[PDB]
Design a protein around this ligand. Sequence first.
Ligand SMILES: Nc1nc2c(ncn2[C@@H]2O[C@H](COP(=O)(O)OP(=O)(O)O)[C@@H](O)[C@H]2O)c(=O)[nH]1
Ligand SMILES: [Mg+2]
Lengths: 89, 166
Amino acid sequence: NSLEIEELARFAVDEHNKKENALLEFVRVVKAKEQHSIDIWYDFTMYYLTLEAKDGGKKKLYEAKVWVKKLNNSHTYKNFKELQEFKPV
Amino acid sequence: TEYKLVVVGAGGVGKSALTIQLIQNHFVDEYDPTIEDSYRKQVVIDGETCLLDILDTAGQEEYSAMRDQYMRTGEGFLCVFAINNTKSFEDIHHYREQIKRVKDSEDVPMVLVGNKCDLPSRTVDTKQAQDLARSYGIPFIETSAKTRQGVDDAFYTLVREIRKHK
Ligand SMILES: Nc1nc2c(ncn2[C@@H]2O[C@H](COP(=O)(O)OP(=O)(O)O)[C@@H](O)[C@H]2O)c(=O)[nH]1
Ligand SMILES: [Mg+2]
């Protein structure tokens, strides 16, 4: 339903690679789920993504959790994006 | 019988002062602005013995599992501004938006509160607040956490609003 699923997935792969000194190549998202929290000011969303990535050639699945703080009264700046979990399956 | 209420508004409008005046019946000058917590008080409203469960919100910049629960299960909302701070009055529109959004509903029990009406001066015109409240289709009540002015009326009006929508 989100129009930033593929983007958040790439962010996940990137952030994993960054943190874990890896070089996974993002292929695509196979499953996505949302946990949307409308708060008094910001919106917070936990994204649960199952993505395909290539690990020095071979295609593997990874489940990623991405945490997103986003505002609907002023663009960016106090927005935020964070990989919480990223594990092979 | 419980009424779950949520008190919202920019920091420094007197959310805590209002809440503590209704619960403990005294004015607290300097309440830690970071402290968010729920408080319960049994009261009588229009001959009804009932329990009010009130979340005094604080720290809107960080996610709160507590606030999350009360946004979902809260029955009514006090949107508070300060009558001597225009910014707090402007923030009201976004608070209301987020409450409508979380309930997916225009028709959420809600009372607009103009706090600090004890002060001899004011910056936000009364008629402006009345005009806004009317546009939203909600009650507007002027309060003073310092003098206790309109505090009972603020929370009870909300309970009456919640009663209407049941
Ligand atoms: N004069 C006056 N001061 C108030 C009133 N309510 C709160 N205050 C003061 O305004 C400041 C912020 O109050 P607080 O309840 O902590 O605001 P909150 O951040 O919304 O919880 C404090 O210094 C309070 O003493 C009021 O009705 N009248
Ligand atoms: Mg407070």
